[PDB]
Amino acid sequence: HAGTMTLEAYMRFSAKLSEAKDEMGTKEYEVFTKELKKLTNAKLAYGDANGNIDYDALSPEKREEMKTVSMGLQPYFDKLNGHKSSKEVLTQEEFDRYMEALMTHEIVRVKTKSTGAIKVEEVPEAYKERFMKAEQFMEYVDEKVR
Amino acid sequence: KHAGTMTLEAYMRFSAKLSEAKDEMGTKEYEVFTKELKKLTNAKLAYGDANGNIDYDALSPEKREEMKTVSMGLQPYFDKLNGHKSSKEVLTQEEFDRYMEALMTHEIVRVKTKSTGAIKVEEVPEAYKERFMKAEQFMEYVDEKVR
Ligand SMILES: [Zn+2]
Ligand SMILES: [Zn+2]
Ligand SMILES: [Zn+2]
Ligand SMILES: [Zn+2]
Ligand SMILES: [Zn+2]
Ligand SMILES: [Zn+2]
Numbered sequence: 001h002a003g004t005m006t007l008e009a010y011m012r013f014s015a016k017l018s019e020a021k022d023e024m025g026t027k028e029y030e031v032f033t034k035e036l037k038k039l040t041n042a043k044l045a046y047g048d049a050n051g052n053i054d055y056d057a058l059s060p061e062k063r064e065e066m067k068t069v070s071m072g073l074q075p076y077f078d079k080l081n082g083h084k085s086s087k088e089v090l091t092q093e094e095f096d097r098y099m100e101a102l103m104t105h106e107i108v109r110v111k112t113k114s115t116g117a118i119k120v121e122e123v124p125e126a127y128k129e130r131f132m133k134a135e136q137f138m139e140y141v142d143e144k145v146r
Numbered sequence: 147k148h149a150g151t152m153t154l155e156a157y158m159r160f161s162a163k164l165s166e167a168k169d170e171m172g173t174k175e176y177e178v179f180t181k182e183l184k185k186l187t188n189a190k191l192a193y194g195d196a197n198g199n200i201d202y203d204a205l206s207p208e209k210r211e212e213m214k215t216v217s218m219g220l221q222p223y224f225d226k227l228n229g230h231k232s233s234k235e236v237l238t239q240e241e242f243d244r245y246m247e248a249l250m251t252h253e254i255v256r257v258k259t260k261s262t263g264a265i266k267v268e269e270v271p272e273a274y275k276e277r278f279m280k281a282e283q284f285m286e287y288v289d290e291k292v293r
Contacts, residue, residue: 120276120279120280121276128275128276129267129268129275132267132275132276132279133267133268135279136266136267136279136282139282139286
């Protein structure tokens, strides 16, 4: 039941945002609330039916901005995943490559309009090599953070 | 990176574990395990490359079936040496078959890339890239189940 699951995970995320207001320093929570509004605005403006963005369609300047927002939000997401921060365990170059890998993965979700597991067979030819390299890199990062 | 030194040490460490298997295993159990392992080590010397990896796709169907049966019987000892539960107990029969196939694909790609370490998909040949990814994922999936 993809709908119910989504509803529940929505209320659950809303509850975490509330625990974030309580637990975060005052400046920290300003900066975070702001970053997250940029992200949620961007998914409403550019995202598909599932809220996935085709980052390759965007201008280089907006793509730079989105990548900056996700760099700032990423350590909160790591913590919610029960992992150590990927920013701390990765190099600056690697952390940049990681954001790019995540973007590639989101683009492929747009092209295959798939919400769960991507089937490598269904990925357009233009994106196969790039996708597989991003999956592999995301796995390497995941193992460094637990 | 000292490939020789690490390969020598792992060699001696594996011999120590064979010695402890002679001691810890039932008489029949160790008889059957010693034969299966001999099949495995004979097959790697007959068909393996410089690193002892086999191109299972080049072999006859009959021989490939045979090597898969040998690996099915050795796999729970290997699970135990990794400090893991038996993949055999935690997977269905069809999944365990596909696991062995994943491991064989992984072995083939090692022959093609000539690499004994982490395989980068870039360096894997086009006829093999998608199979390799699928095998790595399934291997990942199984590994999560046995911890
Ligand atoms: Zn609290
Ligand atoms: Zn870059
Ligand atoms: Zn993880
Ligand atoms: Zn003992
Ligand atoms: Zn089969
Ligand atoms: Zn493991």
